[PDB]
Amino acid sequence: LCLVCSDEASGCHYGVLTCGSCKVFFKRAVEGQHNYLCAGRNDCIIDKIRRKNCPACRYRKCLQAGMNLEAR
Ligand SMILES: [Zn+2]
Ligand SMILES: [Zn+2]
């Protein structure tokens, strides 16, 4: 299971057991430019449904999980 947006995970990538999308998301969200906002809220729960409400919390969530694009 995806330990970010709490969905059926395809396989682990980077540092943690994530879905298919959280992989690609994270690699953009780290080594790229981002425009996700929960920089001064950080309220919403990111799961299988509510992740469409906010892709900002997902970055925070995956990081708490232990994601690292230079993990092992
Ligand atoms: Zn996910
Ligand atoms: Zn949010």
Are 2 and 56 spatial neighbours (Cβ–Cβ below 8 Å)? no
Q: What share of the chain is helix, strand, coil (3-state, %, to 5)?
A: 30, 10, 60
User: What is the C-alpha end-to-end distance of the chain, expressed in Å?
Assistant: 19
Tokens matching residue 41: 């809220």
CA of 40 to the centre of ligand 1 (A): 22
Give the amino acid at 17. L
d(CA 11, CA 31): 21
The ligand placed nearest to the CA atom of residue 38 is 2
Which residues hold their Cβ within 5 A of ligand 2, which is an ion?
38, 44, 54, 56-57
DSSP strands (E only) in 1-72: 11-13, 16-18
Of 13, 15, 38, 20, the closest CA to residue 5 belongs to: 20
Give CA–CA dist 57/29, Å, rounded.
12
Sorted by where each starts, the structural domains of the chain and their CATH numbers stand as 1-72 (3.30.50.10)
Method used to determine the 3D structure: NMR
**R_g over Cα of the chain:** 11
Instruction: Give 68's Cβ-side CA count (13 Å radius).
Output: 5
